[model samples]
Target: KVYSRCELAAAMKRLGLDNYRGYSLGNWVCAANYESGFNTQATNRNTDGSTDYGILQINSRWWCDDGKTPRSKNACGIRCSVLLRSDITEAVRCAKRIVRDGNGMNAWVAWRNRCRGTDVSKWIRGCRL
Candidate 1:
């Protein structure tokens, strides 16, 4: 089924996010949290802290000059702007597409199970589907 940002947020809430979008704790707040703070415009430099660029830290040199997706180039500010205006699901979708494509669903599951304390599919315990 298709997913809207609100729908995904609702599912995440039931999955135990409560407020995963602004959540800033545990490993969840470490990698993805610090990396982008779940933000699209979040970026940082490797050595000089020069602000690499992009919502997922894509870097300005990549799409800003050679990177695609417009987000990477045209509206570089839109990445973070999107996060402020759009829902977490929207930010997650955009970052996931570029970083892991839609296949990142499993990683999200892992994060959910680990942090949210839930399981999945064949391995899920309380699901009713």
Candidate 2:
């Protein structure tokens, strides 16, 4: 499922991403937009032979296990397939774990390049928090 900007914003808020690790709600929304365009089934194979999965683009290198990534640590202890589900509950859980692991939102390069230190509040404008 491809979520609208507002829908993604509301969903992330419900998942407690708002201000998680000092990242504002808008930062998440903006990151999601750039990462996967809010597509639940989004997948991108990286040059390192790892794949990024789901709306948040959790990577298979150190996070979810895709069974194809070499030496996957599966840090999230989840199958990569689960992240592709339209229901983002598992993806959100893994994302929280990623942030809680001290990597912060910077774990996602899309967030760092496109959302960091920017006026991302505009990404959530008109969305009812």
TM for every model, in the order presented, reads: 0.30, 0.94
Model 1: per-residue Cα lDDT over 3-108, one tens digit each:
3333433444454433234342233332343344444444455453223443234444322333233333432334333443334454444443443433332334
Which portions of model 2 show Cα errors greater than 4 Å? none
Please, what is the whole-model Cα lDDT of each candidate in the order they appear? 0.37, 0.90
Best by lDDT: 2
Q: RMSD to the native, candidate 1? A: 10.4
* Residue 79 miss distance in model 1 (angstroms): 5.1
Per-residue lDDT tens digits for candidate 2, residues 1-129, read: 999999888888998988888888898889889999999999999999999999999999899889998877998889999999988889988988988896688788898998887899999999976
What TM-score quantifies how close candidate 2 is to the native fold?
Answer: 0.94
In model 1, the Cα lDDT at residue 74 comes to: 31
Clashing pairs in 2: none
